[PDB]
Design a protein around this ligand. Structure first.
Ligand SMILES: CC(C)(COP(=O)(O)OP(=O)(O)OC[C@H]1O[C@@H](n2cnc3c(N)ncnc32)[C@H](O)[C@@H]1OP(=O)(O)O)[C@@H](O)C(=O)NCCC(=O)NCCS
Ligand SMILES: CC(C)(COP(=O)(O)OP(=O)(O)OC[C@H]1O[C@@H](n2cnc3c(N)ncnc32)[C@H](O)[C@@H]1OP(=O)(O)O)[C@@H](O)C(=O)NCCC(=O)NCCS
Ligand SMILES: N[C@@H](CCCC[NH3+])C(=O)O
Ligand SMILES: N[C@@H](CCCC[NH3+])C(=O)O
Ligand code: NA
Ligand code: NA
Lengths: 202, 198
């Protein structure tokens, strides 16, 4: 069991992280009660990610823990000390060994990509997924991961940082509101997919 | 002014379209009851758009009409539901062809679904000028984006709508889109974004 103080690391994901990303996307879909809709594979991540420079297309940041630079680098890892709220019991620890450092455990991820506001006439960032494994929630790790994205977005002069939440996901809403984000009740998401997308033609 | 059949053209916007795009973004913001929050300028569009290849970043397609390649223009004949009276006609002359009137625009950019593990497209803005609504022009414009998204193997085409905008909701549902009531947009901007530190 992990006790006392942890060292938390937020770093750019590499193709070697595809197995862990696939497992975390599946855990998130299971949390959102959307397992049937989730068809992610390591192969699909290799086909679609790591094609464009980081922050110029879909980009993943990995969150990892362990028991406690030159010019023009894209993303220097963010390293923070975290005093544990309670000791952590992680039965999944061995299946989440980090490919960057063997002594690190992968505990979360975030996927984000550029968006654009016409009212601001400025580019922003959109966060697609934000996920922390169950034994590591409530001790400040999700705050470090979200704030690392926001800090990068601000460095890139983002007008806004946006994302979506399920109306029933009260713990995430409280978490986002506590960081200054506003839940906008007036907007609804529209999706054109599957057969309806196939049928949509001129 | 305009009666019978129109020729509708959907084409890629160039920097010469920044004045009309700015004008149309303002009309949309006014429709969406968000005028005060709209700070678009031609200069801001020149700084943020036309920086990346089309469909690889924020991309605009213009919608233009007249009385009857990365992206080949889409040309369609449109039988007018009712004759059109356009008092703003002279302020919306097309920079591509002088005989064409700019009546709308769409802005879209790539998005990504982790559940599909596939890229898609997100439509930021979709707008048609009031005299040209309800006669099939908006359908042509949205379908032009979807056709390009499908050619680029998009898993989904997504956008958002105000819950009170029943005319856009009906239009979207009629095209096969599903309005998903469970999702809420969260935004970190302004002072809240500036105060967010690590
Ligand atoms: C939402 C999620 C990412 C947040 O991450 P977390 O690691 O659980 O978050 P934190 O621990 O930083 O913050 C959660 C709470 O703990 C509190 N907290 C942080 N450090 C703490 C500490 N050392 N001691 C006590 N409380 C602490 C924060 O103040 C926050 O409280 P609030 O929610 O009342 O503001 C995480 O719970 C998760 O993965 N959930 C399942 C998936 C999900 O909901 N995804 C959202 C996608 S839209
Ligand atoms: C929403 C908007 C983009 C749609 O464009 P439009 O040009 O009005 O759209 P169309 O004319 O293709 O479709 C509207 C309706 O007219 C009908 N229609 C189209 N051509 C027709 C014709 N020749 N004869 C009779 N009816 C016709 C369509 O079937 C559709 O009906 P439905 O709403 O019951 O499905 C437009 O009205 C607009 O700009 N509105 C204000 C801004 C706004 O709401 N933007 C959305 C931001 S999310
Ligand atoms: N373009 C608007 C959002 C409209 C979303 C619905 N089409 C903005 O920048 O705030
Ligand atoms: N990643 C999910 C959507 C989750 C949105 C909220 N984080 C999908 O591809 O459908
Ligand atoms: Na959610
Ligand atoms: Na709307």
């Amino acid at each position: 069991a992990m006790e006392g103080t942890l060292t938390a690391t937020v770093r750019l994901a590499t193709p070697a992280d595809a197995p862990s990303i696939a497992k975390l996307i599946r855990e998130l879909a299971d949390f959102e009660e959307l397992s049937h809709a989730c068809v992610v594979t390591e192969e699909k991540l290799h086909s679609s990610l790591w094609k464009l420079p980081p922050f110029q297309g879909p980009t993943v940041l990995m969150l990892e823990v362990c028991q406690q630079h030159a010019e023009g680098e894209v993303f220097e890892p963010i390293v923070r000390s975290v005093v544990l709220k309670n000791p952590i019991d992680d039965s999944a620890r061995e299946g989440f060994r980090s490919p960057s450092t063997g002594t690190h455990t992968t505990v979360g991820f975030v996927l984000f990509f550029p968006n654009y506001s016409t009212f601001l006439a400025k580019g922003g960032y959109y966060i697609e997924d934000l996920y922390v494994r169950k034994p590591y929630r409530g001790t400040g790790l999700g705050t470090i991961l979200l704030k690392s994205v926001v800090q990068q977005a601000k460095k890139l002069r983002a007008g806004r940082v946006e994302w979506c939440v399920l109306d029933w996901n009260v713990n995430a809403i409280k978490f986002y509101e506590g960081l200054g984000a506003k839940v906008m009740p007036e907007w609804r998401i529209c999706r054109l997919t599957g057969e309806a997308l196939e049928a949509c033609a001129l």
